[PDB]
Amino acid sequence: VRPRSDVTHKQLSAFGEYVAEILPKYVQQVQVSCLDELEICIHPDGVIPTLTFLRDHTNAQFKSLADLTAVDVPTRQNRFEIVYNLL
Amino acid sequence: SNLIEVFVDGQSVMVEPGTTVLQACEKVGMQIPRFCYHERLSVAGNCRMCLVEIEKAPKVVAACAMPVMKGWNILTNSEKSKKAREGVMEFLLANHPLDCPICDQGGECDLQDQSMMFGSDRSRFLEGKRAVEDKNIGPLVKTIMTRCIQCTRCIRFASEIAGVDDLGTTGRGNDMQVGTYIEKMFMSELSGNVIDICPVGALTSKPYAFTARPWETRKTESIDVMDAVGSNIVVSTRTGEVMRILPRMHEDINEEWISDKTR
Amino acid sequence: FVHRDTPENNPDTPFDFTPENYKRIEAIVKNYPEGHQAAAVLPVLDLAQRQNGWLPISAMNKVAEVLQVPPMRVYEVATFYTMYNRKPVGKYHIQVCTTTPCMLRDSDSILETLQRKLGIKVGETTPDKLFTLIEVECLGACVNAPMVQINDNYYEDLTPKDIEEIIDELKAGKVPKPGPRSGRFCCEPAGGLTSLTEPPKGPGFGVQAG
Amino acid sequence: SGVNNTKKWKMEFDTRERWENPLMGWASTADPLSNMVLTFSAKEDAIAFAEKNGWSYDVEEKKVPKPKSKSYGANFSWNK
Amino acid sequence: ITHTGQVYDEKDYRRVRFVDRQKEVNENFAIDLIAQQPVNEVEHRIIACDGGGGALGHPKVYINLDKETKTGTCGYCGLQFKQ
Amino acid sequence: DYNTYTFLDLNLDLSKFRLPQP
Amino acid sequence: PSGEERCIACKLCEAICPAQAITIEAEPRADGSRRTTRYDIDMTKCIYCGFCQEACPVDAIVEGPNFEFSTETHEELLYNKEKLLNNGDKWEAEIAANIQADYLYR
Amino acid sequence: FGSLKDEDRIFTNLYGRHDWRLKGALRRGDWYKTKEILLKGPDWILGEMKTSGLRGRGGAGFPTGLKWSFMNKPSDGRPKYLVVNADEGEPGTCKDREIMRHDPHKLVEGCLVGGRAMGARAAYIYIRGEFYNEASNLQVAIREAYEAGLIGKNACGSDYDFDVFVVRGAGAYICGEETALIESIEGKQGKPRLKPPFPADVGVFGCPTTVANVETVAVSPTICRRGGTWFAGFGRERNSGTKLFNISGHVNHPCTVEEEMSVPLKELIEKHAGGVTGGWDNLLAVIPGGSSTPLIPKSVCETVLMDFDALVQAQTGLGTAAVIVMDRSTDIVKAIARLIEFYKHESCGQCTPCREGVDWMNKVMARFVKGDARPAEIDSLWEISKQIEGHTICALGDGAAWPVQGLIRHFRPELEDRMQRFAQQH
Amino acid sequence: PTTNPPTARKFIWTNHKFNVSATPEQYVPYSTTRKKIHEWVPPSTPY
Ligand SMILES: Cc1cc2nc3c(=O)[nH]c(=O)nc-3n(C[C@H](O)[C@H](O)[C@H](O)COP(=O)(O)O)c2cc1C
Ligand code: SF4
Ligand code: SF4
Ligand code: SF4
Ligand code: FES
Ligand code: FES
Ligand SMILES: [Zn+2]
């Protein structure tokens, strides 16, 4: 069984709240996986605004885009799920 | 009225008085690992692979056979109810002959999967296994009965769904073999259903002995034309020739069974 | 547990309850509730064995008919319990108790004595078919630990020699004083009654009013 | 007897030619949409996929096992 | 011809494939090669065929040689054993 | 000393006493 | 060793092949034994992963040592049961030595 | 404490010494207040049972009163029934063989006294088929009683009508089980049922039924005669009355004597029966309730009152109260090993945990006696043991696990040495 | 191979062959499965 540190699930969780608070107009859901990974979910209109805040905020600098992908859930009305992973 | 409220892991499902513990889990959506319990066959309790843990109770209860009672919480995934499955699966497998690459119920086994999902990863049975002489029960069902987990669903179907009342248990101990005492073929319509109803691959179909393996079979749902009951059936086709026709459930017409002719 | 039809043991051997036996069968059925004749399987099957020790497949079939029960049912009962022979059995059919209580009081010796006394190994029968030796389990009568059940009788509290004596009695003559061939009466304290020494009580004694 | 594969709705395209291959006897198919079976969680969503993609659809209602009353006592009934 | 009686009919054209070429077949056929091996006369009701070589063989299985008439045959090797 | 049919025959004798069936 | 082909057509070598290369169809042989009527490894499809070597319970299908089997025509590369069984007979001595050396590791 | 008086004993005919037939029984005055008692009614009788505090007397000692009471509910148009199990299979039990053979009548009036308590239409006595001679004795006794009119219509002057029958057992220990006795009575294979349809609710032939150890049925008429108090006084607290004790194996005078329940064990063998063969020091272990109960070594044998409460404190069961004693001259590993052999030759095989589990322990136990098995295997059997203990449909799997648990619990060093002994000679 | 010879198993070849690809001994792939859908042959007897 993998070793899990809850330090991260707490740090990341808090940040999630911070982002959400700062960008409430677009953040719909903000979850941390059991794998200690945060996944803010934003309304499509918040693409520009949420990214920019993360690229240029002193308390959250997310300079490089690791990846942009689109899972396709055919059942979901909005078929694609554009996912942007940042570092 | 007539609606007790029982909690399956605190979900407050409500069930008619009379529902078994296994049935209570079903409406929430949980599925008790089960052998020897078939919906349209009488409850027998032979396997005891369904032991669950009602809350605040000393012993675990038999799901398929315990009338639910008001208030009970099922604790289906409780550490205990997992030892009660990690330790039963230890036993079913202990006397089992590992010829899974012979057993044509390879991917159609409710005993490997219930073992891969609800059981342990290893074995401790360093002792020897048993072997039971096979039987020529008929020209349709191949009974490689060294596979049998003595779950008595055949003896039920062969008595309750079909009125054959021939198959029976013979002896006691670890050499209880569920085969006809004298070698009299199981000749009746509704005969082939035993194949579909034995979760083990002890007795399986002799024509479809080794022509395929289930993951490959593409399954198209169609209608029985041999007889006028119009029983629903699933035609399993591989690379374009039909390999098997097995029943698919229609409550009103064929409820999980099909004739010896149409399979 | 499989009856592979054999010329000797197969239905060609016709079976039918002697007229008298059928009378007995009727009474047996009467005990059970009407509409529940099937319950008389065990008793009737036994009667068949009484008639023929072999209890051949034919017998099992007769039982079924007599009780109007599925043939398989008779088979299940016969193959489940152990007092049913399901094969030919020795005239005497001695059975030696070898559960821990008896063994702790040296049951093994008795078995060994019998094996050579009989000249036949356990699980086997003498050539004359007079004696069949079986290692049966607790037959009750544990108190008289060393014990064996010859046919229906219970010879108990036997020292190795005693059996040889009994077997001889069986081999020449009959009815060899069946019972505990020892000084003790039944299951009393061997040396002397530890209780029940005094006379028994009387009617009404220490009775609460009504 | 497991029911975990009778949960989600699936829409499957109609089956087409599967002629034998002359050189090796392998099955050969000319229909591209054959092996494709899309899985949709609800009947409404699957119907939507057919309409916007323009494929014809013929939905079959889910048929779930009806409740069945069972009780171990019955098997020991005085008169069944 | 082949193990399974695979013989192109006198009119089939895949026979053109074999024109000017060898149709690959093996003289050593299993159905026959197993027959040669004699029935093993074991003296125990149930014996096990590990497949020969243990881990280098086939999954271990126990065979019931109780049937006096017939002989047990390992679903794997095909080896036969009789009591 | 008792015969193989003691139990059964004795019982039959008791049949007369046996109370009426259900 | 007796001469009975090891494969018993469980067909999981087909299940785990990543490329869909192995095609197996089987039927009970006259002896009554389980055997494969057709076993076709398409070597051009095969990517030589070696999982089939891994998966087989009787270890009937093995990755043989020879790497030099370049062929003039594409059809020769497709292999039926007779070519593979013949390949097995030719290289059995070395295959047995190779499996002998590495089985403890597996 | 102990030291029951012969006068206050219940089966004076124990050890025979008095005609087991009716005459001797009349001098015993066993049929003295039977008409009156039944005239009292079902309730009063059941009440006396509760006051008695009489526990099972058979295998698990359930309160008798409450149990019988479960069928004192109004008839639903199905005849209620009485079943008196006399299988007496638990290894070490000759306890019941006495009442049946020596004092058949006591049980006959036990049956009708008990019958009106449950309002049973009739009682069937399942004496093990092994005991053919025993059967000969009881129906001779039953025949006498009706001839007298004590049983049958107009039972003993009572409008109550009760008929008593004897059923042939066929050499099965499991037949003894409460749900399985019924099925044998029903004529099917002797396979226990699940408890959810309880025995009273679904009876034999679907008619409410109740099952009692023959000792339990036998004492009910005398307890009503002597009153619950007299009886309840002899025992300790919950554990009450005097239970017959059968001591067999490694004791100077093995015998069945009835003594005040709650009688110290060191004393039982010391006062009645006879001294532990070879001196009390020669006591490796004793199994107080028969094969099913775990054996206790000499740690407690010194001071353990044989009452069910005291034994459960000790982790062992009073059970049939069959004392089997093992001197230091016995291979316990083999002693318990044959009891597991006793259970593989006997469990019905209906349930997966007992079928394979008991066979699995038998195979491991045989290796343990040889010493072939390694030391780590010993704690595995423990784990195999509890898998069987809580998962079985009936109690026999409960019973098979306990002796295994006892051997590991107190004799773990000895088994390790047998482990060691074989490893050394290679 | 001289020092420790190989195991002989009474099926293994004694004459091993090189690439037979350009030579007429070459594998020509063929389906080894028998016919699947047998057909109704007409009746040869004129009705
Ligand atoms: C395997 C097994 C064997 C049993 N054998 C006997 C027996 O020989 N005699 C007996 O009185 N009870 C036996 N019992 C207990 C009965 O099932 C039942 O609990 C008991 O007879 C109830 O009687 P009581 O109410 O007088 O205790 C056995 C139980 C089991 C699980
Ligand atoms: S049944 Fe056939 S498949 Fe399922 S486990 Fe036993 S052998 Fe393997
Ligand atoms: S055959 Fe199939 S169904 Fe009949 S018992 Fe054995 S396993 Fe259960
Ligand atoms: S090759 Fe190995 S795996 Fe593939 S089928 Fe033959 S045996 Fe099963
Ligand atoms: S399903 Fe619960 S007993 Fe077999
Ligand atoms: S053990 Fe032999 S008498 Fe009970
Ligand atoms: Zn083999």
Verify whether the Cβ–Cβ distance F17 to H166 is below 8 Å: no
Q: Is residue C142 annotated as involved in ligand binding?
A: yes
The amino acid that residue G81 corresponds to is: K
Nearest to H197 among D76, D78, D79 (CB): D76
SS3 G34: strand
C196 within 8 A of H6, measured Cβ to Cβ: yes
Q: In the structure encoding, which two tokens stand for residue B207, read together?
A: 């024509």
Place of tokens 């003896």: B155
DSSP string, H179-229: HHHHHHHHTS---PPPSSS-TTTS-BTTB-EEEEEHHHHHHHHHHHHHHHH
Nearest atom (ligand 5) to Cα of B36: 4
Nearest atom (ligand 2) to Cα of B99: 7
- Centre of ligand 6 from the C-alpha of residue H238, in Å: 31
Place of tokens 């349709």: B140
Among candidate residues I33, G101, H164, E80, the one with its CA nearest the CA of residue F11: H164
How far is it, in rounded angstroms, from Cα C110 to Cα C167?
12
CA angle, G59 then G61 then G66, to 5°: 120
H85: which strand partners?
H126, H213
- Which stretches of chain D sit within 8 Å of chain I by CB? 20, 23-26
B241: which strand partners?
B238
* CB-based burial label for H127 (10 Å; 0-12, 13-18, 19+): buried
Q: Which of H211, H292, H396 is the pocket-test mutation for ligand 1 (most atoms within 8 Å of CB)?
A: H211
SS3 B203: strand
- Centre of ligand 3 from the C-alpha of residue B154, in Å: 5
How far is it, in rounded angstroms, from Cα C158 to Cα C148?
8
H197 within 8 A of B42, measured Cβ to Cβ: no
Gyration radius from chain G CA atoms? 14
Among candidate residues H293, H290, H267, H289, the one with its CA nearest the CA of residue H280: H267
Expressed in angstroms, the distance from the first to the final Cα of chain C is 58
Long-range contacts of residues H355-358, Cβ cutoff 8 Å, at least 24 apart: H355/B91, H355/B95, H355/B150, H355/B173, H355/B174, H355/B176, H356/B91, H356/B92, H356/B94, H356/B95, H356/B174, H357/B91, H357/H384, H357/H387, H357/H388, H357/H397, H357/H400, H358/B174, H358/H388, H358/H397, H358/H400
Going by alpha carbons, the residue nearest to atom 2 of ligand 4 is G56
Phi and psi at B236, nearest 5°, equal: -95, 110
How far is it, in rounded angstroms, from Cα G80 to Cα G66?
17
Question: Could you say which ligand is closest to the alpha carbon of residue H83?
Answer: 1
DSSP string, D22-71: TTT--EEE--TTSS-EEEESSHHHHHHHHHHHT----------PPP----
β-strands H81-86, H209-213 pairing:
parallel
* Cβ of C101 below 6 Å from ligand 6: yes
The Cα-based distances of H229 to A11, H47, H57, H224, H235 in angstroms read 72, 12, 18, 10, 10
Phi and psi at F12, nearest 5°, equal: -55, -40
B259 within 8 A of B189, measured Cβ to Cβ: yes
Buried b (16+ CB within 10 A) or exposed e, H15-34: bbbbebebebbebbbbbbbb
How far is it, in rounded angstroms, from Cα H320 to Cα G75?
81
Cβ neighbours of H10 in C, within 8 Å: none
Minimal-distance CA residue of chain C relative to F13: C27
E80: which strand partners?
E73
B239: left (phi over 0), alpha (psi -120 to 50) or beta: left
* Cβ of B214 below 6 Å from ligand 2: no
Verify whether the Cβ–Cβ distance D24 to I33 is below 8 Å: no
How far is it, in rounded angstroms, from Cα B112 to Cα B101?
12
* Cβ of C148 below 6 Å from ligand 6: no
How far is it, in rounded angstroms, from Cα H39 to Cα I6?
97
G79 within 8 A of I1, measured Cβ to Cβ: no
User: DSSP secondary-structure letter at B56?
Assistant: S
Cβ neighbours of F9 in C, within 8 Å: 24
How far is it, in rounded angstroms, from Cα G7 to Cα E77?
10
* CB-based burial label for B228 (10 Å; 0-12, 13-18, 19+): exposed
DSSP string, H33-73: SHHHHHHH-HHHHHHHHHHHT---SSSS---HHHHHHTT-S
SS3 C205: coil
Going by alpha carbons, the residue nearest to atom 29 of ligand 1 is H177
Going by alpha carbons, the residue nearest to atom 8 of ligand 2 is B100
H297 within 8 A of H355, measured Cβ to Cβ: no
Q: Please give the sequence-ordered ranges of beta strands (E in DSSP) within chain E, or none if there are none.
A: 40-41, 46-49, 61-64, 72-73, 80-82
Long-range contacts of residues A55-63, Cβ cutoff 8 Å, at least 24 apart: A55/A86, A57/A22, A59/A18, A60/A15, A60/A18, A60/A19, A62/A86, A62/A87, A63/A87
Nearest atom (ligand 3) to Cα of B151: 8
The amino acid that residue H406 corresponds to is: G
H125 within 8 A of H164, measured Cβ to Cβ: yes
The answer to whether F and I touch (≥3 CB pairs < 8 Å) is: no
H or E segment and range at residue C115: helix C107-118
Q: In the structure encoding, which two tokens stand for residue C97, read together?
A: 């108790």
Domain count, chain E: 1
SS3 B189: coil
Residue extents of the structural domains in chain D: 1-80
H199 within 8 A of H207, measured Cβ to Cβ: no
* Cβ of B63 below 6 Å from ligand 5: yes
CA angle, I42 then I46 then I47, to 5°: 95
How far is it, in rounded angstroms, from Cα B27 to Cα B3?
14
Q: What's the resolution in A? A: 3.5
Half-sphere exposure of B178 (CA within 13 A, CB side): 26
Q: In the structure encoding, which two tokens stand for residue G39, read together?
A: 């076993």
Biggest CA–CA distance in chain F, Å, is 35
SS3 H268: helix
G28: which strand partners?
G34
H152 in reach of chain F (CB within 8 A): yes
Going by alpha carbons, the residue nearest to atom 2 of ligand 2 is B103
H15 in reach of chain F (CB within 8 A): no
- Overall residue count recorded for chain G in this entry: 106
How far is it, in rounded angstroms, from Cα G43 to Cα G6?
21
How far is it, in rounded angstroms, from Cα H50 to Cα A35?
62
SS3 E49: strand
CA C158 to chain centre: 18
Q: Which of F15, F16, F21 should we substitute to test contact with C (largest number of C Cβ atoms within 10 Å)?
A: F21
Q: In the structure encoding, which two tokens stand for residue D79, read together?
A: 């008169």
What domains can be seen in chain H, in order of their start residue?
1-53 (no CATH), 54-233 (3.40.50.11540), 234-330 (3.10.20.600), 331-426 (1.20.1440.230)
G54 in reach of chain B (CB within 8 A): no
Verify whether the Cβ–Cβ distance E76 to B99 is below 8 Å: yes
How far is it, in rounded angstroms, from Cα H110 to Cα H220?
6
Tell me the H-state helices in chain E.
Answer: 15-18, 30-36
Ligand 4 lining (C-beta closer than 6 Å): B 101; G 7-13, 24, 55-56, 58, 60-61
Torsion of CA E20, E23, E27, E30, to 10 degrees: 180
Q: In the structure encoding, which two tokens stand for residue C23, read together?
A: 């009378």
Place of tokens 């599967």: D18
Q: Please give the sequence-ordered ranges of beta strands (E in DSSP) within G3-106, or none if there are none.
A: 22-28, 34-42, 78-79
Verify whether the Cβ–Cβ distance E22 to I34 is below 8 Å: no
The Cα-based distances of G18 to B139, B187, D25, H67 in angstroms read 38, 44, 21, 65
SS3 G36: strand
